[PDB]
Amino acid sequence: HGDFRPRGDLLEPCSCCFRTGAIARVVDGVEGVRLAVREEIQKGATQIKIMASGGVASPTDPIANTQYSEDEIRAIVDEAEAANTYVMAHAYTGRAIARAVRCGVRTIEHGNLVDEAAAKLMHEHGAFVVPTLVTYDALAK
Amino acid sequence: TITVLQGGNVLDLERGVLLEHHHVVIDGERIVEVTDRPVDLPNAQAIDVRGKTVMPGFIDCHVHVLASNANLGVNATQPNILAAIRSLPILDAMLSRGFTSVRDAGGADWSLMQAVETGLVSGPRIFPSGKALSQTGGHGDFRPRGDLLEPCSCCFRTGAIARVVDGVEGVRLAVREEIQKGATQIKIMASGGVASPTDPIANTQYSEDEIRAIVDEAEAANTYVMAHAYTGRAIARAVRCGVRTIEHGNLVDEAAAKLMHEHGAFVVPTLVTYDALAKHGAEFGMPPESVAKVASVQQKGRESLEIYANAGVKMGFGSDLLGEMHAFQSGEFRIRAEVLGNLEALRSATTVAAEIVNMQGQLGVIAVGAIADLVVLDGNPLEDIGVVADEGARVEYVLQRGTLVKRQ
Amino acid sequence: TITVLQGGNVLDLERGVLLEHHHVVIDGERIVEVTDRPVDLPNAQAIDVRGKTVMPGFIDCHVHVLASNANLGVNATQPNILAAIRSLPILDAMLSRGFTSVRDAGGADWSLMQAVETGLVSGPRIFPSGKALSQTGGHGDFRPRGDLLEPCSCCFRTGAIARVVDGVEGVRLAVREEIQKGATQIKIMASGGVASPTDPIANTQYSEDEIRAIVDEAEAANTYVMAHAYTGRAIARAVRCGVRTIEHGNLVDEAAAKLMHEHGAFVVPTLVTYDALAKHGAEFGMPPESVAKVASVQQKGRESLEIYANAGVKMGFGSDLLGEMHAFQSGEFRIRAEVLGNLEALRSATTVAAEIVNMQGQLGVIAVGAIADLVVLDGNPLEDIGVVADEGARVEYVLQRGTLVKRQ
Amino acid sequence: TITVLQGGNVLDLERGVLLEHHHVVIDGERIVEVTDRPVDLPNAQAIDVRGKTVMPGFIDCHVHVLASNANLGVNATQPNILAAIRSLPILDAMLSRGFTSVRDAGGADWSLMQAVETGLVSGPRIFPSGKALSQTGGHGDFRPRGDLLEPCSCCFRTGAIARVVDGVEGVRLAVREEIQKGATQIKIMASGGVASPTDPIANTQYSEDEIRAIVDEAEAANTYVMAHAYTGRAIARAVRCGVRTIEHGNLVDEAAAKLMHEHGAFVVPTLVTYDALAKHGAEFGMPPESVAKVASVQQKGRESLEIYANAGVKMGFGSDLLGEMHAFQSGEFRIRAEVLGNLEALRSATTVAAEIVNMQGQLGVIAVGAIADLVVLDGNPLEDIGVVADEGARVEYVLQRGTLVKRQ
Numbered sequence A: 001h002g003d004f005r006p007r008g009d010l011l012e013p014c015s016c017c018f019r020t021g022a023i024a025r026v027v028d029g030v031e032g033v034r035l036a037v038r039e040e041i042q043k044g045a046t047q048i049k050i051m052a053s054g055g056v057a058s059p060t061d062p063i064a065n066t067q068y069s070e071d072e073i074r075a076i077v078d079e080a081e082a083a084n085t086y087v088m089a090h091a092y093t094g095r096a097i098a099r100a101v102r103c104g105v106r107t108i109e110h111g112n113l114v115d116e117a118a119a120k121l122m123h124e125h126g127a128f129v130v131p132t133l134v135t136y137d138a139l140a141k
Numbered sequence B, C, D: 001t002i003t004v005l006q007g008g009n010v011l012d013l014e015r016g017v018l019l020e021h022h023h024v025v026i027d028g029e030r031i032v033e034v035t036d037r038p039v040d041l042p043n044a045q046a047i048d049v050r051g052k053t054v055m056p057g058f059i060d061c062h063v064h065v066l067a068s069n070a071n072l073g074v075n076a077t078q079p080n081i082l083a084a085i086r087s088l089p090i091l092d093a094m095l096s097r098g099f100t101s102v103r104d105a106g107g108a109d110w111s112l113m114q115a116v117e118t119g120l121v122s123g124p125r126i127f128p129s130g131k132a133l134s135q136t137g138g139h140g141d142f143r144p145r146g147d148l149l150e151p152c153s154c155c156f157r158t159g160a161i162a163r164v165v166d167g168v169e170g171v172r173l174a175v176r177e178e179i180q181k182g183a184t185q186i187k188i189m190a191s192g193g194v195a196s197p198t199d200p201i202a203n204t205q206y207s208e209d210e211i212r213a214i215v216d217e218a219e220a221a222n223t224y225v226m227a228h229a230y231t232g233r234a235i236a237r238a239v240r241c242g243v244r245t246i247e248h249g250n251l252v253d254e255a256a257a258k259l260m261h262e263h264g265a266f267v268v269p270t271l272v273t274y275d276a277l278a279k280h281g282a283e284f285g286m287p288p289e290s291v292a293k294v295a296s297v298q299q300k301g302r303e304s305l306e307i308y309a310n311a312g313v314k315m316g317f318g319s320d321l322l323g324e325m326h327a328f329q330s331g332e333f334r335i336r337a338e339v340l341g342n343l344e345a346l347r348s349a350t351t352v353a354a355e356i357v358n359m360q361g362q363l364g365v366i367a368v369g370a371i372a373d374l375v376v377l378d379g380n381p382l383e384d385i386g387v388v389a390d391e392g393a394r395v396e397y398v399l400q401r402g403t404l405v406k407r408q
């Protein structure tokens, strides 16, 4: 969801940190995300944001399928927690929410496509939701 | 926008019989009415099908559209434009043989899927895998026993069927790359094979941690993994790691077949490719130590089919022919019928095949709601399998998404 | 083996006349006889060309076969397979307009040259430039004003017209690379252009040290350098550094054209593209600032034709059309004939063009020994340039290396 | 739209007078009429400028917009967000001091030029240099005497004044890079200076081959090269290569000035920065070895102004202040006036300055056709220079491209 390169071809985006207009950066791997979280914290971040499912404003990812492995999400969560902070996570479907919450993310962004099952899980795990409904009416218009 | 096939004998693969004098009503790209009743045709365009079999267009679950010659190491090294140009006849031949949908097992990509779907290229609908995933010195690694320098060109060569990736995180990145590139499913090499220089058939490829990584990232894109495996040892480890379809699988035991049934896994045997490499292997440019290896798997090929039927492992239609041997493509029907009966052999390419590509109900059936991928056949395939398996001698009409593509 | 055109009106271009009731006899790929005597046709296959114009096959000295759409920035970024596919209808259309040979000015490689020569692909014989050579921020630099990231993809994208290379040794290596990739001649961007967003047409590209190096490394490989330049300033420095042909050349002065005569340098103007981009500029998806730049070069376009003619500079035929504007290719015949007269407009496509591609005795003329690249035309081109310049309306036969390829 | 300045005292610079009660007619962005005849205003907006000097907007030929603080070492290392932010008061202040156009000598890019011209940012028109070119250990190299790791961050860091490039091909690409990023001219360090760690003022930087490569590339994009050079030795070699303007130039001999006159090379002496660095150098965080280095350049600074006047070398206006010292900007008017007379000091930022930026008869002169960049000045600058040089104490209206931007 943070990758904005078209379906054409893939050369390395080393610019992802350098470009101040970029909302996101691409990083893969358990040790790759640990380093990424450490980088963002020393840069000054107060919480860590991950993309944990597909979305709207990115071209090559359907909203239904989940992003990041559970070993990658746990690595981030634990590196966030180690710097006395938490993880916020973009997630639409109940499937994608449940796993993120089970890996220990604190806030779920959007969360539009929940069931009561994944909602019951957030209650028990002490997880917050930030719905952003006003942007969906804006983008339809 | 409305087309009526009238008077034909519709094949029902669930029941196992022709439904004679039944009309198929197409609107746009979909089938709206399957009926024997005097159908009202106001603004409808008709084709007379009386006394000819109407059936769904076949689906091949294992092709290499981009394999223009039998030496896959030299097929990789050919220039990009020329590699693309050469696949256009191959695609066209498949469509004429009756294949409306093929699943590419390594080679073709999103571009070729686009070319056939916009109508820029005549061919079957492609379910691409992109590049197949192979470990170092594995079945996709076409480097000779000499020396190991990095082929960064593995993604850049259009003619290459596979890319070489090692490591749990390494293969994870490759899957993510292949899915954003636009592959519909992920292909890996879980054992040694025939058409590769440096590897025996009996040994296994990738670690279980590497396969589980791949399986997880494919599922996280709502798709599945196809794995190349021969031995029962290599199949069972792959299936336990959660691969959905097993390609080839010539050397199974019934324990590995039992596990496949229990895990709900599929098999795509590819028996015609070993028969063609038996006659015209070394003739058509394939290296001698590969044609050495082709002898030892074609023996157990028909015997494996029995085990798959016995344990009840669902079987899909696969050809896997390389180069000029692509002509033999329809002949896999005859081989499967010779062991399983042609009801089962037609089921390989229609009902079970559409389940594999996750189009259960959408493709491979003549029902209300399905896409109009249809074939008109001069004879009854239930009686004689040769009416299908004669390089399309007895196929006159091939309809693809409602529109008629082949008139012969 | 042997083909006879009978009763033809053979165009002799140097004598400027129509030799009516002359037979052209072909053996294999070459013209064996031109005669008005009754030919003893025995085994020979005959085409009756009574009361129709027989002239050599046209040679467009400036095409972009791989320019499938009008935005060259977006053309480069399309998938490699799709890029290749989309060029096939373009090539096919060019041949059926009469162009039996083309000189590709950037994009097409040796693969496309083989595709046509092997007969895998229908279309004109291609003299590929490979990729064009452009400096950073140059005419082949399609990167936005945003910021600069390195493109190793410049060589990799088959949809890319050019590549970005800078430095004496950098361009030297570039030329040796392009030649071994199979190019027949070398393209460079010697000045600003219209398509690229960053550079004005008034200013020059590449230092004289770079241009000389590129010329010397082309000459050492028994070939030449074709150069894109607009202003007389830019043209002077290109030709004094030793380029053989100048593309476009819209804004020459007579002192620049005098030097071109004095070095023996050719010019291929491409006037049909600006008149296309006048009516359909941003209409066919080009950036607005490119369409703002296209308004100024056309003005002195027909003007320059006279300037070269006064100075005695041999002029070739070029279209330089992009995307769906490719159909206007024959419209340059008209545009040229207005200013210079039809005989000279036909010389651009034939005798001058063949000298530019270094095939003087072999192509562009009906002589005993030349290659059989022939156009059978209905009506007189010398008396009416409309029989050529109406999208190829009055061309019924196209013969290429003996074999007949088009029938209309 | 249409606006009338009425009853103003219009300053004719080439004739050296104040034409009183002359009206000024603006239409859109340019000046239509400069006359004393009664004003016909039907639907025209009026600004009452009775008994006040109407004169063209001041042009500074050497600023550092992004220089948020005096130490350029710590100015480079500041974050990209915060670097851009701190420059916005600095730009605003210049405009309110009557400066309508500035020529940035390193730091400001095309982004800031866009921000002012599309009214997103209050400030003067910027003529960006991009980054100043410097060699390794040169005047732009702000690395200490510790050790040398590779800096590709030079372009990345927005608060960096300069980038470090070396070699003939190195600078050739560097110029090409900066031009496509949207520079209007090229800035080079052609000797040592004050605000750098490793270089004394006496020694020259870049080889003659590097400077020539920079000059040839700038001329190829129809612009020129500005060069930082102190000593007469350093100035002469830069001029023989062909730099068009010399920055500072505090330590000239008359031999070097004679050469500059003959080569048409301008000078932008920036004396007001050194006086500020004499009292507030160590005070505002710039390292004390740079404050030690500033001792010698300020002495001959006033003495150099006479040499250029004597040899006929054209002199432009330059502040070159860093950080909070940007308040002192106007002081250079008064400093010059004491040596050369206030009429000459007003030519520095108007008519001579507009030639430097290649905008002669467009900016810096009130005429029919000239862009409406105008400054209303309370009192007469020809009598009292303090009406201009008192941080803009006596300026109320500033108009830029037709529209009014200031009211005081």
Ligand SMILES: CP(=O)(O)N1CCC[C@H]1C(=O)O
Pocket: A001, A023, A054, A055, A056, A057, A058, A090, A135
């Ligand atoms: C910046 P974002 O990725 O949170 N976003 C923008 C609009 C909806 C939502 C989306 O693309 O799913």
Ligand SMILES: CP(=O)(O)N1CCC[C@H]1C(=O)O
Pocket: B105, B139, B192, B193, B194, B195, B196, B228, B273, B320
């Ligand atoms: C490239 P592939 O693995 O599909 N293959 C080609 C022929 C048989 C089989 C093999 O080499 O074992």
Ligand SMILES: CP(=O)(O)N1CCC[C@H]1C(=O)O
Pocket: C064, C139, C192, C193, C194, C195, C196, C228, C273, C320
């Ligand atoms: C493909 P090209 O760069 O030769 N070209 C297209 C139209 C005119 C000319 C130009 O941009 O200058």
Ligand SMILES: CP(=O)(O)N1CCC[C@H]1C(=O)O
Pocket: D105, D139, D161, D192, D193, D194, D195, D196, D228, D273, D320, D322
């Ligand atoms: C960075 P710069 O060369 O513009 N500069 C700053 C103050 C005086 C002058 C100097 O260092 O000599």
Ligand SMILES: [Zn+2]
Pocket: A055, A090, A109, A110
């Ligand atoms: Zn989001």
Ligand SMILES: [Zn+2]
Pocket: B193, B228, B247, B248
């Ligand atoms: Zn296989």
Ligand SMILES: [Zn+2]
Pocket: B062, B063, B064, B105, B320
């Ligand atoms: Zn295969």
Ligand SMILES: [Zn+2]
Pocket: C193, C228, C247
């Ligand atoms: Zn061009």
Ligand SMILES: [Zn+2]
Pocket: C062, C063, C064, C105, C320
């Ligand atoms: Zn061109």
Ligand SMILES: [Zn+2]
Pocket: D062, D063, D064, D105, D320
């Ligand atoms: Zn400066």
Ligand SMILES: [Zn+2]
Pocket: D193, D228, D229, D247, D248
């Ligand atoms: Zn300086």
